RNA sequence: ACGGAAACCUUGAUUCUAACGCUACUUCUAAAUAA
């Protein structure tokens, strides 16, 4: 709908020597900037105390925050793979577990 | 010791316009000018983090090296520690993560009466014997076009008695970038940038950067 | 009725430019340096029609139309003691102004921009000069 | 590391740096002793709320206007419009902007545009000043202004672009002198400092000024502009720090070669280091005239506008201005016919 | 008559590639950097034809034809005091415009895309540079 | 009252590190001859 014609762009770069300043070119492939991907992560609760499951929720939240603040795979030291998680929420697909406070903290911390 | 991340956030304002480059994959049907790199969706000019990192490393290589530096992998401790080094197991992943800079003041630029966010500078050359001109066209991002510059610096256990030197290196890299031109034919007056609202914020972990923000405003 | 449809604007460019005037030597009279600003405006307007809706794109279309009607009458090439006006004949044969009149929403606007791209592409195909 | 110079430029004569565009006669109205240059977009917008789009189309589409259907003021008066405020800008009437009168048939059918940024304000690009500086440095150096600057290995002589080394060379240290000289461009200096001067040519063989139909938008005399020249190497630093005393030597050579043949009352006098910027200043100010002499003349030997001897002097007309310098009262020109040497400027370079 | 059948398009791409223009040094004047945009458009249209009907891919085929025509005349190489158009002769010899005109259903689209892939493969096989 | 019954080819692992689309270039030259 945004008129795009290809879902992958070609970024052209070059490398210039520090002594001779000769530009050796290159081109690499990138995904389009505003692409979205469906992200699903399933967490299983067996023999785990309430403190253990809360700690695991905190670790998952910190992992998602760290992925937001770092780059996904690629040449991310040069501006690649910066991701953000949108509409992040947790729904208990199996069993009975309360995730009201988990969803509240997932929407707050993001 | 503890893990932290400091996010240097600034606005790159173009004193003169900027010709980062790229090839004619988004060039309009009929345009013969040299195109500037553009977002594939919005087609607004961008400043790729690769150009910022390359120019900052090249500039700092003439200050913090005191060596020859035939290749990028030969850079010193102070530069390979930040910008990375493929031939050193301790510095394969650098502590500096650059980000692509995208347009932010498009609304303000439109409110200033701008038809298009990129301009086509006509520019020729004159033979010094025959006085015959050979004109051409160069596409540049317009003046007074701000971009969001985000740089991320991690503070791990190895970042003891070295965080201040890294902050100094980042500051003087930005200073040298302001003293020089970002990518383009800046030897004729392109690529002049200025970093505004330069501040560092701890986006993860615990770290006191209250002594860093005042020292950022004091010079840069 | 409409003059531009998604099935014929490419073929319409064929009939628009094949009947353009020509010097006695056979080369074309129009050059890309005359229609440069029109192509730039059309490309920018097509680029902005993706993100920005049409209720505030009417002024850009009116500017494009007045620019067409200016560049058609301004540009002139004089060959062999005979003056000619190539941009005006391009606009006349390609029905650029009539297509501009029917631009009422995003879809027809993008169709007109693609028609302009077709016209310049095919003009370059038959030996047009920059 | 880097040596930064400030170059203050004071134009002693109109300076034009075009962009290829031209105001036709249907884009400006001459009235109330001023030239109004309306924005055609706002013009159309306020004549679509007044319902005169179709006759405007007939006025601009029209291919061969005879004498008076070519002027926008004729359209404005025919359809009884008195709402002249559609963006744009106004240029105060010089007086001397053109021969004949700005009314009537011929007048000004084309006005060459000054270079403007994306906001519509004018500025002087850094590449123009860099080209002038490069001509000054190349014309005042015996290792560059010699017989090696021509390339006779071809059909016609042309400049040896590789006489000054440039570009990356395989297996060799970088040797580009003019990458070090980084001349920046100016700031937008507003539209109030522009005029509509006209090109005149003064022939030494004929001894009278001949006006030509080539009208330009030029910066007014006594305009202060500021440039920044950043240098990185010691060689280019020495060259730029000697830009003054090299401009004087270049001007002395130019005066002893070309300007001495013309009456001293047309040639201007210098307050600061001389320079020649923009279009219309002449071919010798843009060439190594020691080598280009003979070749440039032969380029035009078989044309109708033949270059006779060393050519004519370009003398535009702009209002006389006197500077209250702390030495007395220095008039800009030495003639009472108001004859500026088009393309002239002076500069002072400091090491801020 | 159909210009691209399932049993001759590879052979046609061979014959076209072997018949291209050349300079004195025996190097191909066409390079993959000139036809990169056309290759990307053909690939994108190919992988869009797998799950999307042709009746809403007419705009992509139209743009692809416009781009082929444009890149035919846009780029040129100055050799031996005369100008060559590499993509133009590639289009004329390979009958690209004729295969584009006959694209009517999904199978002809995919056949044309595979023909372009064979053309580039063979061009690279016979010393075509980048 | 089946050479049958019970058996997950499963556990972890970033196609990652380094790289300026860079270099030189005044939108500029020519005004004859006639009156």
Curated annotation (Swiss-Prot), chain D:
GO terms for molecular function: RNA binding. Keywords: Antiviral defense, RNA-binding. GO terms for biological process: defense response to virus. It comes from the Bacteria. InterPro entries: CRISPR-assoc_Csm5 (IPR010173), RAMP_III_fam (IPR005537). Belongs to the CRISPR-associated Csm5 family. PANTHER family: CRISPR SYSTEM CMS PROTEIN CSM5. CRISPR (clustered regularly interspaced short palindromic repeat) is an adaptive immune system that provides protection against mobile genetic elements (viruses, transposable elements and conjugative plasmids). CRISPR clusters contain spacers, sequences complementary to antecedent mobile elements, and target invading nucleic acids. CRISPR clusters are transcribed and processed into CRISPR RNA (crRNA). Csm functions as a non-specific ssDNase. Base-pairing between crRNA and target RNA to form a ternary Csm complex activates a ssDNase activity; target RNA cleavage suppresses the ssDNase, a temporal control that prevents uncontrolled DNA degradation. Viral RNA transcripts probably tether the Csm complex to the viral genome, recruiting Cas10 ssDNA activity which is able to degrade DNA in the transcription bubble, spatially controlling the DNase activity. Part of the Csm effector complex that includes at least Cas10(1), Csm2(3), Csm3(5), Csm4(1), Csm5(1) and mature crRNA. The Csm complex is elongated and slightly twisted with a maximal length of 215 Angstroms and a diameter of 75-80 Angstroms. It has been modeled to have a central protein filamant of Csm3 subunits along which the dsRNA helix of paired crRNA and target RNA binds. The filament is capped at one end by Cas10 and Csm4 and at the other end by Csm5; ssDNA is thought to bind to the N-terminal HD domain of Cas10. Encoded in a type III-A CRISPR locus. This is CRISPR system Cms protein Csm5. The gene is csm5.
């Amino acid at each position: 709908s945004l008129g795009v014609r290809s879902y992958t762009e070609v970024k052209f770069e070059n490398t210039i020597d520090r002594i001779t300043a000769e530009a050796n070119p290159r081109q690499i492939e990138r995904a389009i900037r505003n692409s979205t991907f469906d992200f699903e992560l399933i967490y299983e609760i067996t023999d785990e105390n309430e403190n253990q499951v809360e700690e695991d929720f905190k670790v998952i939240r910190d992992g998602l925050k760290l992925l937001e603040l770092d780059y996904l795979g690629g040449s991310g030291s040069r501006g690649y793979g910066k991701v953000a998680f949108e509409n992040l929420k947790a729904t208990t697909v199996f069993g009975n577990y309360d995730v009201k406070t988990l969803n509240e903290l997932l929407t707050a911390e993001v | 010791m503890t893990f932290a991340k400091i996010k240097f956030s600034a606005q790159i304002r173009l004193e003169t316009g900027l010709h980062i480059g790229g090839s004619d994959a988004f060039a309009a049907i009929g345009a013969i000018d040299s195109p500037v790199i553009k977002d594939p969706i919005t087609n607004l000019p961008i400043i790729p983090g690769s150009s910022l990192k390359g120019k900052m490393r090249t500039l700092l290589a003439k200050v913090y090296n005191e060596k020859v530096a035939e290749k990028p992998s030969d850079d010193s401790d102070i530069l390979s520690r930040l910008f990375g080094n493929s031939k050193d197991k301790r510095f394969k992943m650098g502590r500096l993560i650059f980000r692509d800079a995208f347009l932010s003041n498009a609304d303000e630029l439109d409110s200033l009466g701008v038809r298009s966010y990129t301009e086509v500078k006509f520019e020729n050359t004159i033979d010094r014997i025959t006085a015959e001109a050979n004109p051409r066209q160069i596409e540049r991002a317009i003046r007074n076009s701000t971009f969001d510059f985000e740089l991320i610096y991690e503070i791990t256990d190895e970042n003891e008695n070295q965080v201040e030197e890294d902050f100094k290196v980042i500051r003087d890299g930005l200073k040298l970038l302001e003293l020089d031109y970002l990518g383009g034919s800046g030897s004729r007056g392109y690529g002049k940038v200025a970093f505004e609202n330069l501040k560092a914020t701890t986006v993860f972990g615990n770290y006191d950067v209250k002594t860093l923000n005042e020292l950022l405003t004091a010079v840069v | 009725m409409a003059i531009l449809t998604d099935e014929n604007y490419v073929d319409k460019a064929e009939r628009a430019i094949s009947l353009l005037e020509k010097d006695n030597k056979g080369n074309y009279l129009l050059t890309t340096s005359q229609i440069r600003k029109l192509l730039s405006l059309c490309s920018s307007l097509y680029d902005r029609s993706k993100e920005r809706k049409f209720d505030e794109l009417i002024n850009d279309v009116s500017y494009l139309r007045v620019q067409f009607v200016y560049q058609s009458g301004r540009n002139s090439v004089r060959v062999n003691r005979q003056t000619f006006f190539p941009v005006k004949d391009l606009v006349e044969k390609g029905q650029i102004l009539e297509a501009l009149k029917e631009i009422k929403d995003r879809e027809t606007l993008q169709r007109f921009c693609r028609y302009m791209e077709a016209l310049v592409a095919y003009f370059k195909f038959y030996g047009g000069k920059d | 590391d880097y040596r930064t110079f400030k170059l203050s430029l004071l134009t002693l004569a109109p300076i034009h740096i075009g962009n290829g565009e031209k105001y036709t006669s249907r884009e400006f109205i001459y009235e109330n002793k001023k030239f109004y240059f309306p924005d055609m977009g706002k013009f159309y917008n306020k004549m679509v709320e007044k319902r005169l789009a179709e006759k405007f189309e007939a006025f601009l589409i029209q291919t061969r206007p005879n004498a008076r259907n070519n002027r926008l003021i004729s359209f404005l008066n025919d359809n009884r419009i008195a709402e002249r405020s559609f963006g744009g800008y106004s240029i105060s009437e010089t007086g001397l902007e053109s021969d004949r009168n700005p009314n009537s048939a011929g007048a000004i059918n084309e006005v060459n545009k000054f270079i403007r940024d994306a906001f519509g304000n004018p500025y002087i690009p850094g590449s123009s000043l860099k080209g002038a500086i490069r001509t000054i440095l190349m014309n005042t150096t015996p290792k560059w202004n010699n017989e090696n600057a021509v390339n006779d290995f071809g059909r016609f002589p042309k400049e040896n672009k590789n006489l000054i080394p440039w570009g990356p060379k395989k297996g060799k240290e970088y040797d580009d002198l003019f990458n070090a000289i980084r001349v920046s461009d100016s700031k937008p200096f507003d539209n109030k400092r522009l005029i509509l001067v006209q090109k005149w040519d003064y022939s030494a063989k004929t001894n009278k000024a001949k006006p030509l139909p080539l009208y330009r938008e030029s910066i007014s005399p006594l305009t202060k502009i500021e440039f920044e020249i950043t240098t990185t190497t010691d060689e280019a630093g020495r060259l730029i720090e000697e830009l003054g005393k090299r401009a004087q030597a270049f001007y002395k050579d130019y005066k002893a070669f070309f300007l001495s043949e013309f009456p001293d009352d047309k040639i201007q006098a210098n307050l600061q280091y001389p320079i020649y910027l923009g279009a219309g200043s002449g071919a010798w100010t843009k060439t190594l005239f020691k080598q280009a002499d003979g070749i440039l003349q032969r380029r035009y030997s078989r044309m109708k506008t033949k270059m006779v001897k060393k050519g004519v002097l370009k003398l535009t007309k702009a209002p006389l201005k006197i500077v209250k310098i702390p030495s007395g009262n220095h008039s800009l020109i030495k003639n009472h016919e108001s004859f500026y040497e088009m393309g002239k400027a002076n500069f002072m370079i400091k090491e801020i």
